[PDB]
Amino acid sequence: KKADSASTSLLSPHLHFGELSVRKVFHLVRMKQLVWSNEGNHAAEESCTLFLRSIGLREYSRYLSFNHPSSHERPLLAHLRFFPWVVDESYFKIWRQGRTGYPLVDAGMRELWATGWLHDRIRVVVASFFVKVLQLPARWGMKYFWDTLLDADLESDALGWQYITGSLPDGRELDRIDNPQFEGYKFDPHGEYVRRWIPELARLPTEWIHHPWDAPVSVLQAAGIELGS
Amino acid sequence: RIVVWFRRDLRVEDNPALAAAARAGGEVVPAYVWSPEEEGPYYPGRVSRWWISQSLNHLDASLRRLGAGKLVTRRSADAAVALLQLVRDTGATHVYFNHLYDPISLVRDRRLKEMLAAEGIVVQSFNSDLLYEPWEVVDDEGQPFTMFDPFWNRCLSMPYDPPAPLLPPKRINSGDLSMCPSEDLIFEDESERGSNALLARAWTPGWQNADKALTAFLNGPLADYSVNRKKADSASTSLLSPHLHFGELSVRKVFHLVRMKQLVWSNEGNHAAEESCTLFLRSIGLREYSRYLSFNHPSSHERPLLAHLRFFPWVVDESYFKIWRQGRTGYPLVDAGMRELWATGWLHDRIRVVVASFFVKVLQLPARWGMKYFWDTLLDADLESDALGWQYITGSLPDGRELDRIDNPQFEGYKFDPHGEYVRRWIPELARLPTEWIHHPWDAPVSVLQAAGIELGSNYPLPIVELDAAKGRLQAALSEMWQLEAAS
Amino acid sequence: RIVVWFRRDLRVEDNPALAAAARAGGEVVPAYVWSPEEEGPYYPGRVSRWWISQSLNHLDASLRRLGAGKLVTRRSADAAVALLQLVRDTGATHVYFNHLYDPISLVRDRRLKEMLAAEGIVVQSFNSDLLYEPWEVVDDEGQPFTMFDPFWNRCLSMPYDPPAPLLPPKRINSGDLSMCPSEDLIFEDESERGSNALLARAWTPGWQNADKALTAFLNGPLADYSVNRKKADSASTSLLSPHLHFGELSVRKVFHLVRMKQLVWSNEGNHAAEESCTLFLRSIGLREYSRYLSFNHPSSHERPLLAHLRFFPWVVDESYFKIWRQGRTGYPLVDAGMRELWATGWLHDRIRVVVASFFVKVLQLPARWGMKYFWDTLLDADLESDALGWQYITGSLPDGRELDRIDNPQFEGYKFDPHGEYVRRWIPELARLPTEWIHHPWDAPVSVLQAAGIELGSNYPLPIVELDAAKGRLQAALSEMWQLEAAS
Numbered sequence A: 001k002k003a004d005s006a007s008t009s010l011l012s013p014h015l016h017f018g019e020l021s022v023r024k025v026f027h028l029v030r031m032k033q034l035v036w037s038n039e040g041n042h043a044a045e046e047s048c049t050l051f052l053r054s055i056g057l058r059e060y061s062r063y064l065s066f067n068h069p070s071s072h073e074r075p076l077l078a079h080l081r082f083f084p085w086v087v088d089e090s091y092f093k094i095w096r097q098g099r100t101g102y103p104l105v106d107a108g109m110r111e112l113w114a115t116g117w118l119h120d121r122i123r124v125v126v127a128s129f130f131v132k133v134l135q136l137p138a139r140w141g142m143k144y145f146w147d148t149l150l151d152a153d154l155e156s157d158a159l160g161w162q163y164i165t166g167s168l169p170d171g172r173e174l175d176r177i178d179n180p181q182f183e184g185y186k187f188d189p190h191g192e193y194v195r196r197w198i199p200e201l202a203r204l205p206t207e208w209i210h211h212p213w214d215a216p217v218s219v220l221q222a223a224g225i226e227l228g229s
Numbered sequence B, C: 001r002i003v004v005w006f007r008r009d010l011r012v013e014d015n016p017a018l019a020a021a022a023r024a025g026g027e028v029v030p031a032y033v034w035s036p037e038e039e040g041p042y043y044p045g046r047v048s049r050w051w052i053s054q055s056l057n058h059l060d061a062s063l064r065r066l067g068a069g070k071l072v073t074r075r076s077a078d079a080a081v082a083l084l085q086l087v088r089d090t091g092a093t094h095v096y097f098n099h100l101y102d103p104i105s106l107v108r109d110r111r112l113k114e115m116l117a118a119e120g121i122v123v124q125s126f127n128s129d130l131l132y133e134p135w136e137v138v139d140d141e142g143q144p145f146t147m148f149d150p151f152w153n154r155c156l157s158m159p160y161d162p163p164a165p166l167l168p169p170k171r172i173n174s175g176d177l178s179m180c181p182s183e184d185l186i187f188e189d190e191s192e193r194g195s196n197a198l199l200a201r202a203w204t205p206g207w208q209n210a211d212k213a214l215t216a217f218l219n220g221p222l223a224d225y226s227v228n229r230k231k232a233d234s235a236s237t238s239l240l241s242p243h244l245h246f247g248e249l250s251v252r253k254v255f256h257l258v259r260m261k262q263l264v265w266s267n268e269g270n271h272a273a274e275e276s277c278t279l280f281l282r283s284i285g286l287r288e289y290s291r292y293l294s295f296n297h298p299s300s301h302e303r304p305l306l307a308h309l310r311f312f313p314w315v316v317d318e319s320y321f322k323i324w325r326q327g328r329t330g331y332p333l334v335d336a337g338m339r340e341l342w343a344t345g346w347l348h349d350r351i352r353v354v355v356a357s358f359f360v361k362v363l364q365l366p367a368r369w370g371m372k373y374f375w376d377t378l379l380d381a382d383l384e385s386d387a388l389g390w391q392y393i394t395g396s397l398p399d400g401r402e403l404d405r406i407d408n409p410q411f412e413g414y415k416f417d418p419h420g421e422y423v424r425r426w427i428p429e430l431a432r433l434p435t436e437w438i439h440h441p442w443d444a445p446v447s448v449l450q451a452a453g454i455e456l457g458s459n460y461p462l463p464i465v466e467l468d469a470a471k472g473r474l475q476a477a478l479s480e481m482w483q484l485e486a487a488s
């Protein structure tokens, strides 16, 4: 879940274009598990269980688009039909540029533009922020993702946006906003993800690095931060 | 329910019998039956008996982690009588195993199928030793091959790739084994247990260690196998020899992984490395051909193994045999390899011929004698592959080596040991002997021998038999036999 | 203007003669004269000569890269004669050298001072080999110490530290030495060149390689020296002794570098590594004590080296000496070391103790005989250090090892080779012989020796002298010595 180290496989663009077998990955990972199990490496053995689950989420993305496709009788985000979206091109511009003022969001929006890739949980953060705080049409953000992601994948993108907006019963609650400290402690506990992509805040302590607006002026002056300039 | 009879398939990955039993959804009782009496003249060797007992504890441990209660062991002179007795004690319904191809098991297994069928037992056997079954690769008129090259190039152009390796069972369940008993097997005599344990200096038996050894070769010396496979002065070959004999590592997995290594190197412009896997798979195929020859052309009485020298005048000299055993022959490369064989239960292929070519073409003792020594002191003591290897050096088949001919030791040395570092390592007595003479010290000037502190006869032995006196003896023994040949 | 005379300081860092010649302003003529006939019995032996031939070539290039024409190589039977031909030929004002401490050099080198000061040459000598000069360290009455512990305790408590290693010259100015000729030195018999060159398998002589071996030991096995220094089955020691014998490395740099490693380890809580440095410096101090002994209590005629063993009736037996050199004694730890001494020119200090103790305690051959062999086979053959070692193992020192006593080979084996892997590396014949008997095969039951494939007397020798015979003959030889000693 951490975005402050290279914790994941970085295989998603390779897998989107089919440059790698998922049946090889399955088979190779199942062999690593058998060996680790014989070595007493119980935490590594569960690592394989959980990583295959992530491979299975890609399986479920295809399983969803085949068995319950987008229709007209009920579309993608059908539960948010009468949702009155904020229409505000200015807000969409600030979001793309990572100038929202929420450091975990800005840090990810800067990395998405610079490398074409985002850790799955930073995807959750930037997209949740998009439809929960700015509350802009999810279509808008779905399209930007399509132009900036190297692994832009039809079924997987649909599943992700469906997950973060709560169209799935599996999905994330609708009537709810994440506290940015909840996001920060789970995906960036030492703030090193924010500091890598927003060097401006390097000297801002971990205690406020994910919600600078709450810091006292003295603490923001010590960090050399003037909120607004 | 199902009983998985392990024999020479001591592994969990790509074990079709075990995989098929686990997938049936019932219970899986793994077991090993120790019945060496059924192999007669091929009773397992001394150091092979040590490896097995190491491997079984290794396999038992890995089976229990998968959920098995234990590995069940039974001791009886007849496999079937023990296998039947087991499923009686367990109330089992099936007996799965992987079929072998040596002339002993082909007949013993076949009788077990019928014997167990009669008693009401569902029995099925699976392939786990070979890329392709022998009765799949035939010439274009549908008849078995008789030379290695046409066989292997047909295996390499076979219409379907060899089956990719199966996955190990995620879990196996066997139920209650507290009444199901296992009698401790005895693989070692008490007076040899200590001397046996030192084999662990060089080998750790077990499927896990087979896996690690394969990974090590693939990331290491495999790229340089094309230019160095003949060298013995370094770890140039895979050292997967005893693992593959006990089925601790799937040859089909070796094949698939190497073939895919070939593809990446080809795409990387690494032609030498690409060429290297070609030859390494050929070495795998020689093990295929080992079972081919034993399935199609087995040998008992009309052409038993080394029938062509039925009429050879063997030097029956137990003194010379002992001097060959102790590596006291005065031929370094022969003595070096003979030490390592006793030390680590293993020898490089080319050294396997040096000490063997020497045993039958220089000392000219019964080839059946040095065969029984290899059987007792090789960890990878393999019925079919030992058969092939001797047939090769004696010239018993058209692929083999030229008969009236003896390798000059400097030829051997230059191909297998350019800097003499192999025998300097195993014969530190010769460490100061310059490389030029290191493989033939008896032709060195006394001034050089003493400068190296060598004194032939006291420091390092004199050549027990001279080469001239041996090729001479070779003619006198071969035409005496061809004279005996055309006389019957 | 200034001659720099090299002898056993074949380095360019912390070399006070060369570093003061360069800082005088004028030119510097660096030279080495090969005057072995002056060394009497201590004429450099076979393999020590092979080291100098490489070390000098290696020091030549070093000097030439620093702005020199060459290292002038002179030949003579008298060093002064050749040295003052050179002061003339090359016309210099001064002659600089770093002074040695052996009994030969101590008085040969004061004959050079006067000989050269009579033809108007100014001479200066510097310290290049010791942390402290022998006269600099004394007891409370101003007297030399007689045991090692009080002496080394004093150096460790001296009022000043060992001088920091000097830098090498920025470059040296030699002038035109296109005039000055150098005598092609001969260090190797033609007959021995081919076996002498195999010493490079294990060693590379030279100022540059001494420096790489030190930082290899400092960043490697120095941290475990406290617990592993006695074992010969791993590379537990620095392997710096030949480098230090020829002065290719500063001991003042080693002292200073090791004292810095200790300060860091102490700040890291690494208490076992901190004691490792304490103990390794002690080993550097044993080299200091070797010079301190040869300077303060030299070999005299009133009392020689092994003076306590004057009336000792030695076994005179050239046959026994031949078996000892060849490592066929039948004692595996001894044979293993005698094989490695011949093959590499080096022995771990405790294997030196074993092979030399065996020489004067079991075979009881004249210690002179073994002292001479050591001189011809050791790359680090060092006058004072060899004297100290033989004096230690024979019990001429009060510090030394007990006289009326023989080590049980299992005591030696468990301390220096607990798993027998030293014996098995150098005697592969015994690879399959268990650790429990590998250091005393004669005690094993026949079954255990047959399991190990050992026939004592054919495969590996019998004990040339049995321990109980050796101890009985030792008490009979000492009583013979002690009844004789009182008769005077």
Ligand SMILES: Cc1cc2nc3c(=O)[nH]c(=O)nc-3n(C[C@H](O)[C@H](O)[C@H](O)COP(=O)(O)OP(=O)(O)OC[C@H]3O[C@@H](n4cnc5c(N)ncnc54)[C@H](O)[C@@H]3O)c2cc1C
Binding pocket: A008, A009, A010, A011, A012, A013, A015, A016, A054, A055, A057, A058, A059, A061, A118, A119, A120, A121, A123, A124, A127, A149, A151, A152, A153, A154, A156, A157, A159, A160, A161, A163, A164
């Ligand atoms: C709003 C949103 C949009 C997304 N858009 C995409 C997209 O366009 N393309 C895409 O491939 N994934 C998408 N995902 C899923 C997930 O973010 C990525 O699969 C993951 O970040 C890729 O990094 P990785 O390769 O290191 O994954 P790892 O953790 O290393 O996982 C290994 C592989 O499993 C697959 N995988 C992992 N998680 C998921 C998941 N939730 N759904 C589907 N497959 C998964 C991928 O193929 C991935 O390469 C999206 C998720 C969200 C919440």
Ligand SMILES: Cc1cc2nc3c(=O)[nH]c(=O)nc-3n(C[C@H](O)[C@H](O)[C@H](O)COP(=O)(O)OP(=O)(O)OC[C@H]3O[C@@H](n4cnc5c(N)ncnc54)[C@H](O)[C@@H]3O)c2cc1C
Binding pocket: B229, B237, B238, B239, B240, B241, B242, B244, B245, B283, B284, B285, B286, B287, B290, B347, B348, B349, B350, B352, B353, B356, B378, B380, B381, B382, B383, B385, B386, B388, B389, B390, B392, B393
């Ligand atoms: C006289 C003689 C006796 C032999 N006895 C045996 C024996 O008992 N058991 C045995 O497995 N091999 C035997 N061989 C074959 C060969 O010597 C060994 O297979 C090989 O040296 C083992 O080293 P390796 O595993 O590193 O070989 P590699 O170079 O790594 O070869 C890969 C694998 O291919 C197989 N293989 C390679 N060469 C041969 C070959 N010539 N014949 C059969 N299989 C081969 C082995 O399974 C080997 O592990 C014998 C050869 C000779 C000449």
Ligand SMILES: Cc1cc2nc3c(=O)[nH]c(=O)nc-3n(C[C@H](O)[C@H](O)[C@H](O)COP(=O)(O)OP(=O)(O)OC[C@H]3O[C@@H](n4cnc5c(N)ncnc54)[C@H](O)[C@@H]3O)c2cc1C
Binding pocket: C237, C238, C239, C240, C241, C242, C244, C245, C283, C284, C286, C287, C288, C290, C347, C348, C349, C350, C352, C353, C356, C378, C380, C381, C382, C383, C385, C386, C388, C389, C390, C392, C393
């Ligand atoms: C019978 C006998 C003969 C010996 N002959 C020699 C000889 O010819 N030359 C020689 O240099 N040493 C000699 N020694 C001392 C000792 O054996 C060697 O110094 C040591 O084995 C060298 O290995 P090393 O460099 O790894 O030592 P380390 O343990 O790494 O010690 C570092 C350095 O300390 C010095 N040193 C260590 N132990 C001693 C010691 N006991 N006496 C003097 N200096 C020591 C050496 O310069 C050595 O290189 C002899 C000892 C004995 C018992």
